[PDB]
Scaffold this motif. Structure first.
Motif, PDB file in Angstrom:
ATOM      1  N   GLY A 127      57.954  35.832  26.313  1.00 52.55           N
ATOM      2  CA  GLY A 127      58.614  37.060  26.706  1.00 52.55           C
ATOM      3  C   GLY A 127      58.024  37.722  27.929  1.00 52.55           C
ATOM      4  O   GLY A 127      58.609  38.697  28.436  1.00 52.55           O
ATOM      5  N   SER A 128      56.877  37.247  28.402  1.00 47.54           N
ATOM      6  CA  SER A 128      56.229  37.719  29.622  1.00 47.54           C
ATOM      7  C   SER A 128      56.145  36.558  30.594  1.00 47.54           C
ATOM      8  O   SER A 128      56.726  35.488  30.371  1.00 47.54           O
ATOM      9  N   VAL A 129      55.389  36.748  31.670  1.00 45.38           N
ATOM     10  CA  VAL A 129      55.158  35.663  32.619  1.00 45.38           C
ATOM     11  C   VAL A 129      53.652  35.474  32.806  1.00 45.38           C
ATOM     12  O   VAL A 129      52.926  36.446  33.057  1.00 45.38           O
ATOM     13  N   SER A 130      53.169  34.231  32.627  1.00 45.29           N
ATOM     14  CA  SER A 130      51.767  33.923  32.903  1.00 45.29           C
ATOM     15  C   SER A 130      51.645  33.600  34.386  1.00 45.29           C
ATOM     16  O   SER A 130      52.346  32.710  34.883  1.00 45.29           O
ATOM     17  N   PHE A 131      50.766  34.315  35.082  1.00 44.08           N
ATOM     18  CA  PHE A 131      50.586  34.178  36.528  1.00 44.08           C
ATOM     19  C   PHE A 131      49.215  33.586  36.807  1.00 44.08           C
ATOM     20  O   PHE A 131      48.205  34.122  36.346  1.00 44.08           O
ATOM     21  N   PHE A 132      49.177  32.499  37.584  1.00 43.23           N
ATOM     22  CA  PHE A 132      47.949  31.774  37.886  1.00 43.23           C
ATOM     23  C   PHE A 132      47.698  31.886  39.385  1.00 43.23           C
ATOM     24  O   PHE A 132      48.295  31.129  40.172  1.00 43.23           O
ATOM     25  N   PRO A 133      46.851  32.825  39.832  1.00 39.33           N
ATOM     26  CA  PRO A 133      46.742  33.088  41.274  1.00 39.33           C
ATOM     27  C   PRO A 133      46.111  31.943  42.053  1.00 39.33           C
ATOM     28  O   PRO A 133      46.410  31.771  43.241  1.00 39.33           O
ATOM     29  N   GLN A 134      45.261  31.139  41.425  1.00 38.12           N
ATOM     30  CA  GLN A 134      44.650  29.988  42.109  1.00 38.12           C
ATOM     31  C   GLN A 134      45.481  28.752  41.778  1.00 38.12           C
ATOM     32  O   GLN A 134      45.176  28.008  40.854  1.00 38.12           O
ATOM     33  N   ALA A 135      46.575  28.552  42.535  1.00 40.76           N
ATOM     34  CA  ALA A 135      47.505  27.464  42.216  1.00 40.76           C
ATOM     35  C   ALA A 135      46.797  26.113  42.174  1.00 40.76           C
ATOM     36  O   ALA A 135      47.195  25.219  41.411  1.00 40.76           O
TER      37      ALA A 135
ATOM     38  N   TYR B 232      35.698  47.579  23.365  1.00 32.97           N
ATOM     39  CA  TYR B 232      34.728  46.503  23.190  1.00 32.97           C
ATOM     40  C   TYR B 232      34.624  46.155  21.722  1.00 32.97           C
ATOM     41  O   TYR B 232      34.696  47.052  20.880  1.00 32.97           O
ATOM     42  N   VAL B 233      34.419  44.863  21.416  1.00 32.05           N
ATOM     43  CA  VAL B 233      34.034  44.458  20.067  1.00 32.05           C
ATOM     44  C   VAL B 233      32.841  43.523  20.161  1.00 32.05           C
ATOM     45  O   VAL B 233      32.678  42.795  21.145  1.00 32.05           O
ATOM     46  N   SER B 234      32.037  43.506  19.104  1.00 34.84           N
ATOM     47  CA  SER B 234      30.921  42.577  19.010  1.00 34.84           C
ATOM     48  C   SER B 234      31.368  41.288  18.310  1.00 34.84           C
ATOM     49  O   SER B 234      32.405  41.234  17.645  1.00 34.84           O
ATOM     50  N   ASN B 235      30.554  40.243  18.441  1.00 39.33           N
ATOM     51  CA  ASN B 235      30.838  38.957  17.819  1.00 39.33           C
ATOM     52  C   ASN B 235      30.483  38.934  16.339  1.00 39.33           C
ATOM     53  O   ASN B 235      30.506  37.862  15.722  1.00 39.33           O
ATOM     54  N   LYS B 236      30.148  40.093  15.759  1.00 44.41           N
ATOM     55  CA  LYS B 236      29.724  40.141  14.363  1.00 44.41           C
ATOM     56  C   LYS B 236      30.841  39.702  13.424  1.00 44.41           C
ATOM     57  O   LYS B 236      30.656  38.814  12.586  1.00 44.41           O
ATOM     58  N   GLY B 237      32.007  40.336  13.519  1.00 40.34           N
ATOM     59  CA  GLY B 237      33.140  39.946  12.682  1.00 40.34           C
ATOM     60  C   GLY B 237      34.310  39.365  13.445  1.00 40.34           C
ATOM     61  O   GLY B 237      35.356  39.076  12.840  1.00 40.34           O
ATOM     62  N   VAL B 238      34.169  39.152  14.746  1.00 44.05           N
ATOM     63  CA  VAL B 238      35.252  38.726  15.616  1.00 44.05           C
ATOM     64  C   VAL B 238      34.938  37.325  16.121  1.00 44.05           C
ATOM     65  O   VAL B 238      33.806  37.052  16.545  1.00 44.05           O
ATOM     66  N   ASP B 239      35.923  36.428  16.027  1.00 38.59           N
ATOM     67  CA  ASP B 239      35.832  35.083  16.586  1.00 38.59           C
ATOM     68  C   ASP B 239      36.579  34.944  17.901  1.00 38.59           C
ATOM     69  O   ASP B 239      36.174  34.140  18.750  1.00 38.59           O
ATOM     70  N   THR B 240      37.680  35.675  18.066  1.00 38.31           N
ATOM     71  CA  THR B 240      38.534  35.566  19.239  1.00 38.31           C
ATOM     72  C   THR B 240      39.086  36.936  19.587  1.00 38.31           C
ATOM     73  O   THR B 240      39.208  37.821  18.735  1.00 38.31           O
ATOM     74  N   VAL B 241      39.445  37.079  20.851  1.00 38.02           N
ATOM     75  CA  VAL B 241      40.165  38.235  21.367  1.00 38.02           C
ATOM     76  C   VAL B 241      41.367  37.671  22.117  1.00 38.02           C
ATOM     77  O   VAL B 241      41.284  36.570  22.672  1.00 38.02           O
ATOM     78  N   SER B 242      42.510  38.353  22.052  1.00 40.27           N
ATOM     79  CA  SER B 242      43.677  37.939  22.821  1.00 40.27           C
ATOM     80  C   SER B 242      44.101  39.110  23.680  1.00 40.27           C
ATOM     81  O   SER B 242      44.267  40.221  23.166  1.00 40.27           O
ATOM     82  N   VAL B 243      44.277  38.859  24.970  1.00 44.93           N
ATOM     83  CA  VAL B 243      44.804  39.853  25.909  1.00 44.93           C
ATOM     84  C   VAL B 243      46.031  39.236  26.551  1.00 44.93           C
ATOM     85  O   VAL B 243      45.913  38.255  27.294  1.00 44.93           O
ATOM     86  N   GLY B 244      47.214  39.781  26.243  1.00 42.83           N
ATOM     87  CA  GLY B 244      48.446  39.165  26.724  1.00 42.83           C
ATOM     88  C   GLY B 244      48.603  37.769  26.140  1.00 42.83           C
ATOM     89  O   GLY B 244      48.502  37.567  24.926  1.00 42.83           O
ATOM     90  N   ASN B 245      48.831  36.778  27.011  1.00 42.94           N
ATOM     91  CA  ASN B 245      48.975  35.386  26.607  1.00 42.94           C
ATOM     92  C   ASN B 245      47.663  34.611  26.698  1.00 42.94           C
ATOM     93  O   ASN B 245      47.680  33.380  26.630  1.00 42.94           O
TER      94      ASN B 245
END
Ligand SMILES: CS(=O)(=O)N1CC2(C1)C(=O)N(Cc1nc3cc(Cl)ccc3n1CCCC(F)(F)F)c1ccccc12
Lengths: 432, 432, 432
Positions: free
Chosen positions: A263-271, C357-370
């Protein structure tokens, strides 16, 4: 079907028709080698010294817009699995699951299921064929063949401080890799994509030297998960657009790969970090921003109200070319000689000052100054979209330059601020 | 004879006396390996498995101012030739030309003449020496020697996704490379230059895996054409020039390699990409701008009216050194300890705040803060050109900073704009 | 004990508890190989051709704030030693010192003492075991083993133009390297550090092909000297801090590694160039600035009066994450979906717009957008330092943006200048 459009108004081009294969996650597997803990005699002796030195060796080892991207830790997942392998009994659990078979799934203590693979059984060879003793030169040659893989794996880990990428065929042969792929917890489309692009998989994978213990050498191979496949991708190429009189320039800074994604666009600036095989585009979301899909409006209307298109401004009108998927953008300024030449390498077009474009249909090379460029000969259809260069719409007297991280709106607001001061002073001086 | 001049006025130095060897084009050759399509028995069997796996493996494979540079497609020429090889009969035309000899020129369908080279005839060995059968351990060892090159070429292509650079000696031995060079469509000066710098040629070449068909494995080796040779080149080194009181700085941004070329000057902003062997400078015009020869005036008169010299401005007065061809520029600011030490590594000079320079004549190392630098010990003559630092000519109250892509004139115009406002306000306030 | 603090006020985090091992100098050693100048017969013949080709081959060969760093010449020291070896008798002096032993210290003519090491004696093997002659297949296999190292060293030098890094185990085995280390003119703490991190030593070393003369092949191996060890180091991670309404942003630009060093602080802006083994941090002072220790005040009080903390400003509020040593900074802006997930990969936190911010104590992954990020699972204690985002203190109407090389004070002065003009115009217009 690859197609391309050149936007004369903004000195940019979009190549379309590509399909995504985005690395979105990581799959961790555990690769093991079972070890023996211990003239022709002289040859077999030093081959055993190589074996012994390799083992202690590994034991000693065990003891424009890129600046906007975040910062990942690419082997965090595999290193996390490796730490689990150092826990009591964790190696014995793997060694038991591989006694009868060479490939098995093991559930790790941290709640992760991993494929394990015994790729070489040196324990079986040394203990049952070498420990009795030579008579036969075939046996020393045979030992050199079985030992060689361990020696090369060790060499690779030694010059890479225990972490290699791409994953070599010593780490994992193509049979082993194809075998691993067929049993991964992934869709059939993923298995087919990985199996038909094994060399790209290798380049996106890591091998992480992990543990040598209880006569087992173990390394983690961290393979890409392609959680986005077959969505449309397009490549944006951009080049400086300058007046051709004291000259001002702008360049679209959003060059790079774009793929539809969730639903969004993934943008890769270093082609250049993405890998392209035919019309399939392998990029890594660690190297991307996630943008609204309205970013694509910058290609059809850079002044659109829905998305603030990114540009940089300057007064540095130097000449260059950008070779696109299906042609060449030429930014020709000053006194530079800029030409395009045909299949017989006769000049068939001389570029005027400005930003212009040719397709690869009748052109083999472009020359800008002293730089000759070969164009890509990929088949496809290019369309030249005529339009007045947008740099012509700017008053150079109030044009803000040396803007690197700028946009259409940001530049407009600076222009407005500059014009407001001039109008205020002209009226304040006339009243005085 | 390498010589060098340090310009105290602009914190920069020019190293002269070098001769060009610029990569300006590409020569494409086609390298072929003829294949056989099919205790000691057990050893020869698995060696044949390696041969067979390698073949199917390749078949699976077949299925500061750098930002101003353009964007090329470095293997467009070789990939274009490879596409031609996939056309009907094109491989049979090469296979016929190499039946009697191992090297021949073939005219391709797209109007390009290529040198073809059969570097390994596995077909001849397998069909006439192995297919009859073992008795002799010499025959299994012999097969391991003939097979090894194919196995290593395959390994190389496998971890590089079919495109390697530099070109290894498995791809092309030195005999083969020197042989190829002697028959290229190039001048005798080019052949001599390539033959005496074969390791640089290898680093500028590509090997492109192309086709495996009709018992022929073919890859394209794309070799550099050096169309500019023996013109003068010079290296420009630059370092920040700051006041030493609230401090302002400027740095010449045009650092890099410069070579005379076809009436203009080829400028390579990333000097580290060029390769230097003695006094010969190998650069690639893909990494260059083509500039008027008046760019050199910036070294003798940075305020000259013929060319607008490029600078960046800032207030970040941090200390560092730039090691030149024949000495060291030292930018020493704040509290930093900056020294130069002699052949016995005794300190012989302590730098004051400012930009200064020593030659490699009596100096082995320079230390700036906690960073020790070894200077190059190349023989040559250095000249210290005295001059007042140009940063002293700027009023800090109207100095524009954070200018990255700037120039002498651009900075002057901003200064003029700032001074005009101050003079206008002082007169408008006095009248009120 | 690794610990970490996240500064909510400035969108940054500091990871502490690491110990330095800084490369500060170079140690040059001379590695020599003694050469012989000259069905089973056919096998031994072509193995001798490989030997001869390798020899003539080498003879032909012999014939954000990174932009603030200086420019070194990393192999100046080894190249300087190599030039000394070409002087008359200098090779014979080494050949005499190694007649009776395989390792010896030689004083060079330029006043430098070097360790010399004979790692392979092909002269002894060819002259005394091969020159008499075959009868025995053991002798041809033996020759292939002795010759192979020379062939691989030659291959390595051939594709690297005579200068390799990291130093391979063909250049120097681990036994040879550990032996060299034990006799270097260095402290016992240095020997222990090098011996326990041999793979890092290899990665920081160079092998420089030097001379082949008087039946001696010599290359220089340039090894790191670690003149700063066991001082405290800390890693600074930074991410964009934007308003969350027309939005303005700033980012601390001083991200990188910091190590106490000789009363100052060595700052390494490209953290990715340092190598980290457990809690030991290997950085190279060539890649550093030397800063006052007050630079650390930017972590506790970015407005402190003793040091002018560096920032960049912009209006580009895009979302991303920075994975730290013990957690993850998340810059979440606009419509981006930003989450953190636990050991079962269930979402346990959804980030609001802003920097968090989160610590690695209870977190394995973070997702930002895609973009999914795995966090590092290193054990340690993280502390969240609450504080109002400093971007909230800035009036956006006078906020200077597109400042890359800026600082707290620089930005304040521009703000002051902008406010002064507005206050002057409002009073000048009211009087009129
Ligand atoms: C020699 S360099 O190659 O090391 N280079 C770094 C360099 C020179 C550069 O390119 N700029 C232009 C620029 N102005 C900017 C303003 C914003 Cl707000 C954001 C980004 C910006 N940039 C791009 C920098 C991004 C990064 F360096 F991280 F890649 C720039 C400006 C001032 C100082 C030094 C420089």
């Amino acid at each position: 079907n690859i197609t391309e459009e050149f936007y004369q108004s903004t000195c940019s081009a979009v190549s379309k028709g590509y399909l995504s294969a985005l690395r979105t996650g990581w799959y961790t597997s555990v690769i093991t080698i079972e070890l023996s803990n211990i003239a022709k005699v002289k040859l077999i002796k030093q081959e055993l010294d190589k074996y012994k030195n390799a083992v202690t060796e590994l034991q000693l080892l065990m003891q424009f817009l890129g600046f906007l991207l975040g910062v990942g830790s690419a082997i965090a997942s595999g290193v996390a699995v490796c730490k689990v392998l150092h826990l009591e009994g964790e190696v014995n659990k793997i060694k038991s699951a591989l006694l009868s078979t060479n490939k098995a799934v093991v559930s790790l203590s941290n709640g992760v299921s991993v494929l394990t693979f015994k790729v070489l059984d040196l324990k079986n060879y040394i203990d049952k064929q070498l420990l009795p003793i030579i008579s036969n030169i075939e046996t020393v040659i045979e030992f050199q063949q079985k030992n060689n893989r361990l020696l090369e794996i060790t060499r690779e880990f030694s010059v890479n401080a225990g972490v290699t990428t791409p994953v070599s065929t010593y780490m994992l042969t193509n049979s082993e890799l194809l075998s691993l792929i067929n049993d991964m917890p992934i869709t059939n489309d993923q298995k087919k994509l990985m199996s038909n692009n094994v060399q790209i998989v290798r380049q996106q994978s890591y091998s992480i030297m992990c543990i040598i213990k209880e006569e087992v050498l173990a390394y983690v191979v961290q393979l890409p998960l392609y959680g986005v496949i077959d969505t449309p991708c397009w490549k944006l190429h951009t080049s400086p657009l300058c007046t051709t009189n004291s000259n001002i320039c702008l360049t679209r800074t959003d060059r790079g790969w774009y793929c539809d994604n969730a639903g969004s666009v993934s943008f890769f600036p270093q082609a250049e970090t993405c890998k392209v095989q035919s019309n399939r585009v392998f990029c890594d979301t660690m190297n991307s921003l996630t943008l609204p899909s309205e970013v694509n409006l910058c290609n059809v209307d850079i002044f659109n109200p829905k998305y603030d298109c990114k540009i940089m401004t300057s007064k540095t009108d130097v000449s260059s070319s950008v070779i696109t998927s299906l042609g060449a953008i030429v930014s020709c300024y000053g006194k530079t000689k800029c030409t395009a030449s045909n299949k017989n390498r006769g000049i068939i077009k001389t570029f005027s000052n400005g930003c212009d474009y040719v397709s690869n249909k009748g052109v083999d090379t472009v020359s800008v100054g002293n730089t000759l460029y070969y164009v890509n000969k990929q088949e496809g259809k290019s369309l030249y979209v005529k339009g007045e260069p947008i740099i012509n719409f700017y008053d150079p007297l109030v044009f803000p330059s040396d803007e690197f991280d700028a946009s259409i709106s940001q530049v407009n607001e600076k222009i407005n601020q500059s014009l407001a001061f001039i109008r205020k002073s002209d009226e304040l001086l006339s009243a005085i």
